[PDB]
Amino acid sequence: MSKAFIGKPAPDFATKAVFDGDFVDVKLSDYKGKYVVLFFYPLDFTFVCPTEIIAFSDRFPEFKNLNVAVLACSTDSVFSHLAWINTPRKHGGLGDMKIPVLADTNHQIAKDYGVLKDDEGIAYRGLFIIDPKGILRQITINDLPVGRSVDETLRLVQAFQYTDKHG
Amino acid sequence: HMSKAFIGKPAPDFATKAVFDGDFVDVKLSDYKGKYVVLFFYPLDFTFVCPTEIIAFSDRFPEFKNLNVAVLACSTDSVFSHLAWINTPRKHGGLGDMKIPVLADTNHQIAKDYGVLKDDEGIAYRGLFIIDPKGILRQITINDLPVGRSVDETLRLVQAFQYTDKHGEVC
Amino acid sequence: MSKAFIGKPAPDFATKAVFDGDFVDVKLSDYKGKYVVLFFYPLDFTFVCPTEIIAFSDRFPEFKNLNVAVLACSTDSVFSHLAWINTPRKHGGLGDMKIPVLADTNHQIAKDYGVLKDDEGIAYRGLFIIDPKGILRQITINDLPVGRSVDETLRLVQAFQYTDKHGE
Amino acid sequence: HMSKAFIGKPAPDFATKAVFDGDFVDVKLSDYKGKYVVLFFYPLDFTFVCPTEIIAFSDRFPEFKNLNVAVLACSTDSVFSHLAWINTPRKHGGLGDMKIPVLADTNHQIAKDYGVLKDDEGIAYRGLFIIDPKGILRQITINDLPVGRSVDETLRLVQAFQYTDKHGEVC
Amino acid sequence: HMSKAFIGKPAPDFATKAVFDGDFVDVKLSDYKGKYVVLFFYPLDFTFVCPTEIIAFSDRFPEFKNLNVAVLACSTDSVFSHLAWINTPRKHGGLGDMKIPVLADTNHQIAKDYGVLKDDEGIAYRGLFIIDPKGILRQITINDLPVGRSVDETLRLVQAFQYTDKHGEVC
Amino acid sequence: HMSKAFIGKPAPDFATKAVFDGDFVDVKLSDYKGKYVVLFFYPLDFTFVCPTEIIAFSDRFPEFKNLNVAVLACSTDSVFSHLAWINTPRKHGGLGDMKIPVLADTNHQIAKDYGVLKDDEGIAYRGLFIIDPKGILRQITINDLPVGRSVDETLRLVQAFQYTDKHGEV
Amino acid sequence: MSKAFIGKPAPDFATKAVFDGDFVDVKLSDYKGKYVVLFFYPLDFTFVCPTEIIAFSDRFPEFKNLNVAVLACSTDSVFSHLAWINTPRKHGGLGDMKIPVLADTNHQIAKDYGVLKDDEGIAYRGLFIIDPKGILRQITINDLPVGRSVDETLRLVQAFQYTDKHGEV
Amino acid sequence: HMSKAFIGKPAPDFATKAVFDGDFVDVKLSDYKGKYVVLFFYPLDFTFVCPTEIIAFSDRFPEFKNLNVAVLACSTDSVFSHLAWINTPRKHGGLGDMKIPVLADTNHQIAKDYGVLKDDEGIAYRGLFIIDPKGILRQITINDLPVGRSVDETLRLVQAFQYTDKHGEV
Amino acid sequence: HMSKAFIGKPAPDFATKAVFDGDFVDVKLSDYKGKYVVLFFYPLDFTFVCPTEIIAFSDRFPEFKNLNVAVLACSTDSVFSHLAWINTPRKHGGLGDMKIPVLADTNHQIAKDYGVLKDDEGIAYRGLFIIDPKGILRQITINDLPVGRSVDETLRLVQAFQYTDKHGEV
Amino acid sequence: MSKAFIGKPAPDFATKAVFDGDFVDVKLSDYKGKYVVLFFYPLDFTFVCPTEIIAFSDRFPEFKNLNVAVLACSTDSVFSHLAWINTPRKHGGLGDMKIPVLADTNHQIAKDYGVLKDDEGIAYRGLFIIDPKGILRQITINDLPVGRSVDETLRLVQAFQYTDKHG
Structure with missing residues (x-):
């Protein structure tokens, strides 16, 4: 079933997403030549504040600084995404997002x-690190109750960029 | 893979979470034994197109209740998505108060x-489906996305089924 | 197994039918460029008066007005259809039919x-709505005791014709 | 899919609805144990050519009754179709009064x-088939659509079987 | 192994040795293309049962020839057995002179x-089978062993197929 | 479909009708328990070739009887065909009077x-087969159609088997 | 798994054999144009006198006169064949053999x-008669205790050669 | 052939030999019921690259012990290879003293x-895997060979799992 | 078809006839429960090359007997072949008097x-195979046809297994 | 699963090995025209002194005299091979090895x-003898507790070389 393997081309994806309040098409091949962090989350509009997801958006300048694309993804629709983005953060919403939020209704x-x-x-x-040649370098999968660290993600990405150059 | 919905056969059993009265509840088909059930589907929460079609079944639910008929809405959206759309007022394009359960089928x-x-x-x-008191499927309706359903036609069908249940065919 | 799926080409058919007191050949490809309503009924010569079938015939000018073909079908033969058509409505027959009645004996x-x-x-x-390109747009199937509405059928066909042009 | 009719083997069991004396009745093969049965098939009700072949078996049924032989007609038409054709006068190409059951095989x-x-x-x-008192198939006749059967030949075959049943073969 | 004989389908092809006019000949179904063929089977050469049934088809062959119809007898006995039976006088239970081919179906x-x-x-x-000029099977008759066939019935069937080939069904 | 004849294994069981002394009889393999059996096959009743080969086994049956051996002839022809050939005089190519059962194998x-x-x-x-008193198959012989079998050889074989049963080998 | 059927091509064979003291290759295809008798025996060096096998060698001139080849065969090796051939009949050996003795160690x-x-x-x-066209004409199989006859074998082969020319009597 | 590690499902069970405190022991996963388990994999003993990553998990084991968490290292090298590496001083590129079991997966x-x-x-x-007290897999981490893991991150994860086990989400 | 000989697994069970001390005897693996067995194969009786290799195992059998080890020779030749070769003087390439069973593996x-x-x-x-008192296969040796085996090596091996059975390794 | 059969081409192998303190590639085809002895051992760093393995290295001159290549192999890595080689024999190591030691971590x-x-x-x-044409001539497999003899190996190889020339 799963097609995600370390050292093998990362599973190709093409889907609709919300970026800058608009519906866009996102393909994996669009990010050829850059590192990609693809991360998944379970549900739009959960009672638990989406601080972990917001953290990746707020701190995206640090990833852009490193020439790294960051993509969020859930099985919710693009319409569901836009509604949650249009919900203020003080009301448990996502607010402004500086990263594309992919829909995986499929x-x-x-x-x-x-x-x-x-x-x-x-x-x-889940969180996945894909290199500029489209090769899967890192696999992270958490059970639902536990979120991910931007610091750890940055550590991993930078170590991979470093070892790509120096070994 | 395969459809399990056949006229004259037990309706495909379902058990899922739903939003009713702003709360998350468990809904099973067996809950409605002894009662007619109208199960209808819709594509997506938070669509820009007027949800008037879905709303009509909620607004006119008293007519179904008077016929002792349960009405169930269902989409592939989550129960959290349903609740948020229900909490959005109808002037903002939301669902508002729903008088019927809205089932989540993220599965x-x-x-x-x-x-x-x-x-x-x-x-x-x-899609819209009519299931009798014994859990037997009596009616299948499936529309392509652009075209909505009529409450009047649904009411015509269910009343015709209740009648013919007791007296055979009408002439 | 069933071949009828929404958004997919409607299951092709070719059979004999009674139209205007004669035996004719009816093919789905004959209706290319037109909306088609195909409806099924269980049996010729039932004791229950065939009012729902008659309604589709009597109100066919409304369908012709919208450039829509209406086809009736049962598993009875064309000989059975013709005999029921030649039976007066007074005596529980179909009478004059303005729509083709297809035979599906096989x-x-x-x-x-x-x-x-x-x-x-x-x-x-069962009732099915097929678009000008031969694509299945609507599925309706009733258990035996419950008939169909011409008004609802017209609502559906006009809604599809409309959304084909304008969207919503 | 597969024919079950074999000479010297139990005749394929049947159970269906029929028209007899203007009424809907149930007919089972086991109803005729201890008696010879002639079961014959015809293609279509309301045929354009006069049903003289079928009528002959009805008109001459007393000859079968005298031999204690049951005669059954069968087609893939419905029981409602049969009744209407029976109610059509022979002058207008109908069956008229039938003295034999006419079986429905819509199945x-x-x-x-x-x-x-x-x-x-x-x-x-x-097709025409002769079944003995023990339910054993004794004779198979199948004609292509255009050519009918003989009551005389059917009578010859049946009484020959009855005769050989207690006296052995004939010459 | 199963039957290949179906009404409206090409009659099962055959090729075997036969006795005709006191000599061994080869017979193929394709030899009879353009003509109606009656192929009939019998159980055994040299039986103590009067072979009048088989002889009737030979004695009355001129009536089949008049109609341009070929008649073939067949059993599982060998050609050598056939010839010996043919060479046995009818008064000693033999077949005597035969006017039709007698096919051997030993395998x-x-x-x-x-x-x-x-x-x-x-x-x-x-068993008896009628095959049309195009090699299409039109009629199937199979009798249990104790009951013989009628030349008159066979002539009726053949003439009816010939008639209906030209005109279709008639009153 | 498949041959059941194997040396040292029980000979394939058989039960069929036969002509013996002009009458129809039932013949079973089990009828010959405690006795040697020579079962031999032939192709066809009423061939143009004189059946001297088959007649030999009948004419010299006393030699087999003296050794307590049963001899059975068999073909795929019916019991009615056998009788008619038996009733055909040897002068006219028939079997004539047969002193052994002629089995029918229309099956x-x-x-x-x-x-x-x-x-x-x-x-x-x-084909010719030798079956011992215990029903065990001892010998298989199969000839192509043009060549017949020898009564002398058959007698040599059955006597050798009867001797070996008591004494062992040479 | 038996491939031996009357009226069908005789199962092809190719194996090592002892002929005239030496190891040779024998093939069925070598015998195209001739009748061939192939016969089997259980074992080299048995306590029972090998007169049955010896008989086919001693009387081989009668087969050669009729242009018929004779082959003996057992599951023993060509080495034990030769050793048995090199044993005088005096001491229960085969002695000089005038026919190939095939080794079917396979x-x-x-x-x-x-x-x-x-x-x-x-x-x-077992004993098998194969015609000039390679067609199997005769099958003989004896249980171990009973031997075969050279006279019967000669009768069979000559009758096949005769019928081949003339048909039946 | 096929991976058996799935989130929310029982962690793939194992029994194998390991070096613990300079000695050969038998380790079963079922032994750790009632405790969180961190199982992490490394490629090879005696690599020229400093084993600082593996060393960190041993050096900081007190932090795991205080959280009642078991830590297990694993590679496809044998226990004899493990022990020789453990007996190699850290100044010579060895592991030195290990406070955690080092499993051998020569299998x-x-x-x-x-x-x-x-x-x-x-x-x-x-690879690194977190298994709860009931034996259910809670976390999967797999890194390509060139990049190591963080004890701090591992500690964050396990504490978050322990925390939400009692309380739910924030 | 398929080899069943695996180190550490129960040795393939065998049962056949053998020539031993002027008689044909039955030999089974189970007869040797409680002692070491050396089973060795050779290609052919009556080969032109002197069977010095096979003779060595017979001549030096007292050395195996003293260690409580049974030695069995085996080829695909029959017992009658074996006997005749044993009856052949060693001067003329025979086996002569054999002190060990020679097994016949004709099937x-x-x-x-x-x-x-x-x-x-x-x-x-x-081939040569060493089987322990419990019936477990301990050693596999297979040589191409031209090269024979050593009694000294076989003795070394069996003594080493007997020793380690009680002691472990050095 | 075994591909080793007498009289058939020996199973081809290609792997990393330690030779003369360095990492090298070893292929079976490298030894075409020579007899090859390939022998297997269970484990690096066992408590039992590796005398049997050492014997094949110490006595390699005798094999080279006969133009015979000797290869040791175990499922251990090339790294633990090297470490064991760098362990002096007085501390239970392999010491100086005159033969390639193959890694079969695969x-x-x-x-x-x-x-x-x-x-x-x-x-x-296990020990295996392969001829100049790549054909397997000898199969030896011992249970774990019992070692191989160099004298026997030399006897076998010389007997094979001898019969190659004289029959």
Whole structure:
């Protein structure tokens, strides 16, 4: 099922996303020549404040500084994404997002990356690091209750960029 | 993979979470034994197109309740997505108060079992299904996305089924 | 197994039919460029007066007005259809029919549209709306005891014709 | 799919609805144990050519009754179709009064079990079968559509079987 | 092994040795292209049962020839057996002079293809088949062993197929 | 479909009708328990070639009887065909008076079980089989159609088997 | 798995054999144009006198006169064949053999002719007659205790050669 | 062939030999019921690259012990290879004293079951897995060979899992 | 078909006839429960090359007997072949008097089970196998046909296994 | 699963090895025209002194005198090979090895030669003799507790060389 393997071309994806309040098309091949952090989350509009997701948006300047693209993804629709983005952060919404938020209503991307929780049709808290040649370098999958660190993600990305150059 | 919805056969069993009265509840088909059930699907929460079609079944639910009929809405959106759209006032394009349960089918299992899943998109077609007190499927309606359903026609069908249940065919 | 899927080309059919008191050949490809309503009924010569079938015939000018063809179908033969057509409505017959009545004695059409009641060799009360390009746009299937509405059928066909041009 | 009719083997069991004396009745093969049965098939009700062949078996049924032989007609048409054709006067190409049961095989099951179904049309070939008191198939006759059967020949075959049943072969 | 004989389908092809006019000949179904063919089976040479049934088809062959119809007898006995039986005087239970070919089906292939082989004995049932000028099977008759066939019925069937080939069905 | 005849294994069981002394009789393999059996097959009744080979086994049956040996002839022809050939005088190519049972195998079951059936013709090859008092198959002989069998050789074989049963080898 | 059928091509065979004291290659195709008698025996060096095998060698001139080849065969090796041939008949050996003695150490030939006694890896006393066209004409298989006759073998071959020319009597 | 490690499902069970406190022991996963387990993989003993990553998890084991968490290292090298590396001083590129069990997966079974085996080389990728007190897999981490793991991050994860086990989300 | 000889696994069970001390005897593996067994194969009786290799195992059998070790020779030749070769003087290439059983593997079952059958020829390669008191296969030796085995090496091996059975390694 | 059969081309192998303190590539085809002895051992760094392995290195001149290549192999890595080689023999190491020591971390070679002990991923003490044409001539497999003899190996190789020339 899962097509995500270390040292192998990262599973190709093409889907609709919300970026800068607009519906856009996002392909993996668009980021050829750059590092890519693809991260998944379970559900739009959860009761628990989406601080971990917001953290990746607020701190995106640090990733752009490193020439690194960051993509969020869930099994919710683009319409659901836009509504949550249009919900103020003080009301539990996402607010302004500086990164594209991908819709995976297909489940195809979650399936290809092996992060789909089958019985619920939601993605586990997975994070993947793809290099400029489209090769999968890192796999991170968390159970639903536990989020991810921007610091750890930056550590990983920089170490991979370093070792690409110096070994 | 395969549709399990056949006229004269037990309706595909379903068990999922739903929003009713602003709360998350568990809904099973077996909950409605002894009662007629109208199960209808819609594609997507938060669409820019007027949700008047879905709203009509909520607003006119007293007419269904008077016939002792349960009405269930269902999409592949989550229960959290449903609640947020329900909490959006109708002037803002939201659903407002819903007098019927809105089922979450993030699983896709219900849409698959009723044969209404549009595979390439993970959304349900505009399907509507009538299930009798014994859990037997009596009516299948599936519309392509652009065209909505009529409450009047749905009411005509369910009343015709209740009648013919007791007296055979009308002439 | 059923071949009828929304958004997919409608299951092709070719059979004999009674139209205007004669036996004719009817093919789906004959209706290319037009909306088509195909509806099924269980049996010729039932004791229950065939008012729902008659309604589609009587109100056919409304469908012709919208450039829509209406086809009736059962698993009875054309000979059975013709005899029922030659039976006056006074005596429970169909009378004059303004729409073709298709014969599906081999059951292939009912099977392809998923409306065959296997144990009886009769079709459930199915109705299908096919667009000018031959694409299936609507599925309706009723259990035997419940008929269909011409008004609802007109609502659906006009809504599809409209959304084909304008969107919503 | 497969014919079940074999000489010297139990005749394919059948159970279906029929028209007899203007009424809908149930007919089972087991009803005729201890008695010879002639079961014959015809293609279509309301045929354009006069149904003289079928009528002959009805008109001459007293000759079968005197030999204690039951005679059954069968087609893939419905029981409602049969009744209407029976109610059509013989002057107008109808069957008129039938002294024998006319079986409905809308299933195609009986025609299939007897291997007389013309698949591409869902109609039976002109088959005739003679079944003995023990339910054993003794004779198979199947004609292509255009050619009918003889009551005289059927009578010859049946009384020959009855005769050989207690006296052995004839010469 | 199963029957290949189906109404409206090409009659099972056959090629075997036969006795005709006191000599061994080769017979193929294709030899009779353009003509109606009656192929009939009988169980056994040299039986103590009066072979009048087989002889009737030979004695009355001129009536078939008049109609341009070929008649073929066949059993699972050899050509050598056939010839010896033919050379036995009728008054000693022989066939005597035959006016029709008597086919040998020792390897049972023909009886199997026509579905008339009584498996436990390696003999044919009293089957008779009518094949049209195009090689299409039009009629199937299979009798249990104790009851013989009628030349008159066979002539009726053949003339009816010939008649209906030209005109269709008539009153 | 498949031959059941194997040396050292129970000879394929058979039960069929036969002509013996002008009458129809039932013949079973089990009828010959405690006795040697020579079962031999031939292709066809009423051939143009004189059946001297088959007649030899009948004419010299006393030699087999003296050794307590049963001899059985068999073909795919019916019991009615056998009788008619038996009633045909030897002067006219018939079998004449037969002193051994002539088995009918219209079934083909016996010829198939002994692996002597010529499939394309539904006749047996000239097979001969020796079966001991315990029903165990001791000897297999199958000839192509043109060549017959020897009574002397058959007697040599059955006597050698009867001797070996008591004494062992040479 | 027996490939031996009357009226069908005789199972092809190719193996090592002892002929005139030396190891040779024998093939069925060598015999195209001639009748061939192939016969099997169980074992070299048995306590039972090998008169049955010896008889086919001693009387080989009668076969050669009729232009008929004779082959003996067992599952023993060509080495034990030679050793048995080099043993005087005096001491229970074969002595000089005038016919090839094939070694079927494979069991392939015994398997193909349906004469292999599986549990023991030895051949039953089978004998087979093959015509000039390679067609199998005769099958003979004896249980171990009973031998075969040269006279009967000569009768069979001559009758096949005769019928080949003239048909039946 | 196939990975058996799935979030929310029981962690792939294992029994293998390990070096613990300079001695050979038998380690079973079922032994750790009631405790959180961090299982991490490394490619090879005796690499020229400093084993600072593996050393960190041993040096900082008191932090895991205080959280009642077991830490297990694993590679496809043998226990004899492990012990020789442990007996090699850190100043000579060895591991020195280890405070955590070092599992031997010469079998490759554990690396296969956790989907971390680099097939063509018979070495494990830098995988790390968190297994709860009930044996349920809660976290999957797999790094390409060139990049190491963080004890701080590992500590963050396990504490968050322990925390939400009692309280739910923030 | 398939070899069943695996180190550390129960040795393929065998049962056949053998020539031993002027008689044909039955030999089974189970007869040797409680002692070491050396089973060795050779290609052919009556080869032109002196069987010095096979004779050595017979001549030096007292050395095996003193260690409580049974020695068995085996080829695909029959007991009658074995006997005749034993009856052949060593001066004329025979085996002469044998002090060990020579097994006959005529149906090839043993050679197949030990994976030493040269299939195209129906002969065994020069295989030698050591089986312990419990029936466990401890050693596999297979030589191509031209090269023989050493009694000294076989003695070394069996004594080493006997020793380590009680002591472990040095 | 074993590909090792007498009289058939020896299973091909290509792997990394330690030779003269360095990492080298070893292919079977490198030894075309020479006899090859390939022998397997279970484990680097065992408590039992590796005398049998050392014997094949110490006595390699005798093999080279006969134009015979000798190769040792285990499922251990090239890194632990080197470390064991760099351990003096008085401390239980291999010391100076005059023969290449192959790494079979793959298990591929051990599987191909039918010497892998599956439950442990170690090779049995197998020894194999391959001729100048690449044909397998001899199979030796010992259970773990018992070692190989250099004298026997030399006897076998010389007997094979001898019969190659004289028959």
